[PDB]
Design a protein around this ligand. Structure first.
Ligand SMILES: CCOc1cc(-c2nncn2C)ccc1Nc1ncc2cc(C)nc(NCC(C)(C)C)c2n1
Length: 257
């Protein structure tokens, strides 16, 4: 019902999600201001998993200054038993919002796409490749999309649909082009209401369809135009032929209108 971080006291209202050892809570400080606290239990954690939480917290701190499209971290407490992270509170995650919302506005979709690109470009500049991008990694904070995690530490829950073909074939990798494919799948969902390989239920057959070059991804005609070109450029199976993020930021879809 109550917890202490550094010196400040916070009162728990409700739980948002869990990730094995991790937990996210909606809190309030002494001045009745809303915040989000991530609690990580380290009692069962090993030397490899401990260093992965140490690495993601360090990058979250450094990248605060570099972009406003990355979640805000205010303070943290790290001991041998736990981790407490005082972060900003979002309205909803992108996945929970996408499932509830039927039709999406084209001006809202265009705005969200630019936000995702800005956030993923920042981590790439610092040599980070997420490699597990999905809508749940993005948070809606006052009509703006912010990136929650960097994929260094372990994931959380409140799918193989966003996996690039090169990851499956690698059984010396990978490149920032892998995140471009995953981002493309999120945009394809915001455009057609389904992921490029959602139709296949059998996971063995679905994985074969992603790597198969003869398998043609469906691109139905829509009033937009530059949007259809982005989708075809992001969803290219060859990463060397796939579009880059600096190129995407200069594309007519992102710059014109
Ligand atoms: C006050 C409203 O709070 C939320 C309600 C919903 C939600 N609405 N319907 C369903 N859900 C889950 C979703 C998100 C938030 N805000 C939030 N803020 C800050 C957050 C920080 C972190 C590190 N992880 C969150 N979330 C984890 C998840 C993606 C795994 C959920 C965070 N979540």
């Amino acid at each position: 019902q109550s917890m202490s971080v550094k010196g400040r006291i916070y009162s728990i209202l409700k739980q948002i999600g869990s990730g094995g050892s991790s937990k996210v809570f909606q809190v309030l400080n002494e001045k009745k201001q809303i915040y989000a606290i991530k609690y990580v239990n380290l009692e069962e954690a090993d030397n490899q998993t401990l260093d992965s939480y140490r690495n993601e917290i360090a990058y979250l701190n450094k990248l605060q200054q570099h972009s406003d499209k990355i979640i805000r971290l205010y303070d943290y407490e790290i001991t041998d038993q736990y981790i407490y992270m005082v972060m900003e509170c979002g309205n909803i995650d992108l996945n929970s919002w996408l499932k509830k919302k039927k039709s999406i506005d084209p001006w809202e979709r265009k705005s969200y796409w630019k936000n995702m690109l800005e956030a993923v470009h920042t981590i790439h500049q610092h040599g980070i490749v997420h490699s597990d991008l999905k809508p749940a990694n993005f948070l809606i904070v006052d009509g703006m999309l912010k990136l929650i995690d960097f994929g260094i530490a372990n994931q959380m829950q409140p799918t193989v649909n966003y996996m690039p073909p090169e990851a499956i074939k690698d059984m010396s990798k990978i490149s920032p082009k892998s995140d471009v494919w995953s981002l493309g799948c999120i945009l394809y969902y915001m455009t057609y209401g389904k992921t490029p390989f959602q139709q296949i239920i059998n996971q063995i057959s679905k994985l074969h369809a992603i790597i198969d070059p003869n398998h043609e991804i469906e691109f139905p005609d829509i009033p937009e135009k530059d949007l259809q070109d982005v989708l075809k450029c992001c969803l290219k199976r060859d990463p060397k032929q796939r579009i880059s993020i600096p190129e995407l930021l200069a594309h007519p879809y992102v710059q014109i209108q």
